[PDB]
Amino acid sequence: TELLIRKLPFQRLVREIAQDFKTDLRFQSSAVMALQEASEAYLVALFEDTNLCAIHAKRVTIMPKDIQLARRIRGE
């Protein structure tokens, strides 16, 4: 097993969104790791749903419209 998202860019993005929310915040290493794991799991689930939509649409190439349909049918 291994992480699919780059640790440093992901951590930088987390810090950026945290500063956007509220400045002068600090997160734990385990917290950042848990966020990365949850994000990877969520993205994999979303990709599986988008692949199902594309399969249904009789295609091979995944499309942003497929992702949108997946998110809609999920209810987000």
Binding site: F10, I17, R26, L43, V44, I62
Partner: protein, 78 residues
């Protein structure tokens, strides 16, 4: 911004593990946007819990509670 830091090969590898054989060019920006929305919601919930607990730093427990509230429990960091 750092949202673009998410490498194109990283998104491609996530999609591969999911089960996508061919990706389109318009997928990477959309995936980055969706990931940004999800992380924003999780951090919102986590900062709410942190303010509730009156702590100075976000913790793995707060992140796990936020993920539970969303509906995607995560073990390991408990």
């Amino acid at each position: 911004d750092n949202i673009q830091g998410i490498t194109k090969p990283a998104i491609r590898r996530l999609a591969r593990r999911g089960g996508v054989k061919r990706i389109s060019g318009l997928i990477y920006e959309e995936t980055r946007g969706v990931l940004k929305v999800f992380l924003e919601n999780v951090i919102r919930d986590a900062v709410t819990y942190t303010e509730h607990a009156k702590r100075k730093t976000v913790t793995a427990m707060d992140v796990v509670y936020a993920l539970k509230r969303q509906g995607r429990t995560l073990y390991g960091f408990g």
